[PDB]
């Protein structure tokens, strides 16, 4: 289906060669040809503002007689439902309104949000849901539709529109926010970049044409900035009053119409659409150059072009706050009422500090305040949303818990804590305590074999410590995947790895003169897979590197060693698990053999290091090498025993509880433990509205 016009632009040709679907290629071709004929983008726009330039207009203790009612639009994604609930508790008041958009790809979070909206009459969920990728044009589409929806809800007489993410948190009380906005109810709060505007346009790619399709932002070519209007932008977090939102939504004048068209094909549209419209509209004199937010920008860490695979551009994102940042929420310089970003899996202590600062400590004896639970798998989403790696390992963790139940009962006769596993895991949680990862919580079903009854259980597994130092600047060493360069940690928190994974080695360093070290990767039968030196500059805090290891990796316990002139410094270990599932079905002999017998070539790398095995005392045993070939052919129960002995060597079943009635007389009820996802977690629990109108 050739295009409507000759497509010659290098960027369009690149997008068409990378796009995955026909529909996308079609829309790419259509957009490019429309723009080539000059019928897609407006070329001149009317300015209605009577000011020569920008306005820049210029206390929270009083009690207003006519307090504003706020429409909070929450645009949320991911797994952090309990943190969302905690933040919702802090910002909730019975007189405001909450309209929650959950990313189409975040079905677990959406189910949790529905429980909230079913509880409270002033909480609703968008029935439509977009896949709001980073920088996507769909984010402006999401705000504009939510504004239209909210203006049509006549039962909700709201005065301001405030957008928040699940990583935002208030830094002042609701009372102070309402008092401030009630005094300035005719103003709009938007923060501009304030620096050179030509540089802003170029860095934002505003003079480039983009198209969102297939959950990707395709760069299609250049375009002109329309004449007659001033273009501006900055933060996409703002507070807009109802009168301005009505203008944006229902006006058909030249400015709004053409800007809606222009920004349908714009990267990061929400960082400049509302600025450009406001400054060129009849409301230009209402603009306050302050979005009342603190955004934790840190360009040295947050600008790693980390979204290069989602958008045809390089971007930056704010860092997560840490405890050392608490004093920044107490600045009196300018009015500020919210901040971002906060992530409980990164640092929950600063969240707790902030929440108790605003609304007081919880009563003594309140449980769970230093804990965090985050669901990373939920049964309604299906085992096909897991990978073969995580399905394999979650199954193994459950069986590890069942063995702990059996061995924890000391009886002469029939063991009433012996179980047979049933089906697949029902849910998996990450578990953190005092900002330390504690491992996984697996909820699973099993038959109690003494009474022959199905029971629902939860197992806590914790990884064994493997980092070992020897007689320096090295503080830690870890192997993982999905390294987050902004937050300097692996987002695959358990280090779960399969034979087809490409592991990454990380080192953490303290201050001191520059130094060079040697890293050596050792596979489970003592084959040296890779060796390299790395410079550790005096200012370096983290280093990492993904060695090019031919796949598949031999399963078992690998070791990574760090040397300093052949002097041992430290070592860590990691587990490449053999898989018991292929495409979520039990693995078959021929696939098991091809996956578990080491890399296709003889070695892991073109260069061999057989010369170093005697130097480092890593001799290769023919009897182990042989037993690994025998293991590579195993399936069924034999493969299960190989995997489970590997897992048990690197993981510990810390505890196991029953969710309901149990016949095992030493099993605690989950809700009565301190660690279970069923135990009380009041800081994230939402109850009845109090007489003061609050939940917190």
């Amino acid at each position: 289906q050739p295009p409507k016009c000759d497509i010659s632009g290098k960027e369009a040709i690149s997008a068409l060669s990378r796009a995955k679907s026909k529909h996308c290629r079609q829309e790419i071709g259509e957009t490019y040809c429309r723009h080539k004929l000059g019928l897609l983008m407006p070329e001149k726009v009317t300015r209605f503002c009577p000011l020569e330039g920008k306005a820049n207009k210029n206390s929270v203790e009083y009690m207003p007689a006519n307090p504003v009612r706020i429409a909070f639009v929450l645009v949320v994604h991911g797994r952090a439902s309990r943190q969302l609930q905690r933040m919702f508790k802090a910002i909730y008041h019975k007189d405001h309104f909450y309209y929650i958009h959950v990313d189409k790809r975040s079905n677990y979070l959406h189910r949790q949000v529905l429980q909230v909206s079913r509880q409270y009459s002033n909480v609703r969920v968008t029935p439509w849901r977009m896949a709001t990728i980073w920088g996507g044009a769909s984010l402006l589409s999401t705000y504009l539709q939510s504004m239209r929806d909210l203006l049509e809800m006549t039962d909700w007489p709201w005065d301001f529109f405030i957008n928040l993410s699940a990583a935002d948190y208030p830094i002042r009380t609701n009372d102070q926010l309402v008092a401030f906005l009630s005094r300035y109810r005719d103003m709009n709060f938007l923060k501009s970049h304030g620096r050179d505007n030509a540089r802003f346009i170029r860095k934002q790619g505003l003079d480039r044409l983009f198209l969102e399709c297939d959950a990707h932002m395709w760069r299609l070519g250049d375009r002109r900035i329309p004449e007659g209007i001033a273009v501006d932008g900055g933060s996409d977090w703002f507070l807009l009053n109802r009168r301005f939102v009505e203008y944006v939504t229902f006006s058909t004048d030249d400015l709004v119409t053409k800007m809606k068209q222009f920004y349908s094909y714009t990267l990061l549209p929400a960082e400049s659409f509302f600025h450009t419209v406001l400054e060129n509209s009849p409301h230009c004199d209402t603009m306050v150059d302050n979005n009342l937010r603190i955004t934790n920008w840190n360009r040295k860490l947050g600008c790693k072009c980390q979204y290069k695979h989602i958008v045809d551009w390089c971007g930056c994102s704010p860092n997560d706050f840490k405890p050392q940042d608490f004093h920044r929420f107490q600045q009196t310089a300018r009015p500020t009422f919210f901040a971002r970003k906060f992530e409980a899996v990164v640092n929950q202590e600063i969240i707790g500090q902030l929440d108790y600062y605003l609304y007081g400590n919880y009563p003594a004896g309140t449980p769970g305040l230093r804990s965090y639970w985050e669901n990373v798998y939920d049964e309604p989403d299906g085992i096909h949303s897991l990978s073969d790696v995580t399905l394999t390992l979650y199954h193994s963790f459950a069986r590890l818990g069942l063995r702990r139940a059996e061995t924890s009962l000391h009886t002469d006769g029939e063991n009433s804590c012996r179980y047979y596993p049933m089906g697949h895991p029902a849910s998996v949680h990450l578990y953190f305590l005092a900002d330390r990862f504690q491992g996984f919580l697996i909820k699973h079903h099993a038959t109690n074999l003494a009474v022959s009854k199905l029971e629902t259980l939860e197992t806590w597994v914790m990884p064994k410590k493997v980092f070992k130092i020897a007689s320096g600047r090295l503080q830690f060493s870890e192997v993982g995947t999905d390294w987050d360069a902004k937050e300097r940690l692996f987002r695959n928190f358990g280090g779960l790895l399969g034979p087809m994974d490409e592991p990454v080695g990380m080192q953490k360093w303290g201050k001191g003169p520059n130094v060079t070290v040697t890293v050596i990767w050792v596979d489970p039968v003592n084959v040296i897979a890779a060796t390299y030196d790395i410079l550790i500059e005096s200012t370096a805090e983290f280093t990492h590197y993904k060695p090019p290891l031919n796949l598949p990796l031999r399963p078992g316990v690998w070791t990574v060693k760090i040397l300093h002139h052949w002097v041992p410094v430290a070592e860590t270990k990691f587990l490449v698990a053999p898989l018991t599932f292929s495409n979520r079905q039990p693995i078959k002999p021929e696939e098991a053999l091809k996956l578990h017998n080491g890399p296709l070539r003889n070695a892991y790398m073109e260069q061999s290091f057989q010369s170093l095995n005697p130097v480092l005392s890593l001799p290769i045993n023919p009897a182990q090498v042989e037993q690994a070939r025998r293991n590579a052919a195993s399936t069924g129960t034999a493969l299960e025993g190989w995997l489970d002995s590997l897992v048990g060597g690197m993981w510990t079943a810390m505890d196991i509880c029953a969710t309901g009635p149990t016949a095992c007389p030493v099993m605690q009820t989950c809700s009565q433990t301190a660690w279970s996802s069923f135990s009380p977690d009041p800081k994230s629990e939402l109850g009845a509205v109090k007489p003061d109108g609050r939940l917190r």
């Binding site: 860095k203 934002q204 790619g205 900055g234 933060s235 996409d236 990267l267 990061l268 960082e271 551009w313």
Partner: peptide, 7 residues
């Protein structure tokens, strides 16, 4: 205050 960082 903006998130874009060039091509």
């Amino acid at each position: 205050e903006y998130s874009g960082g060039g091509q």
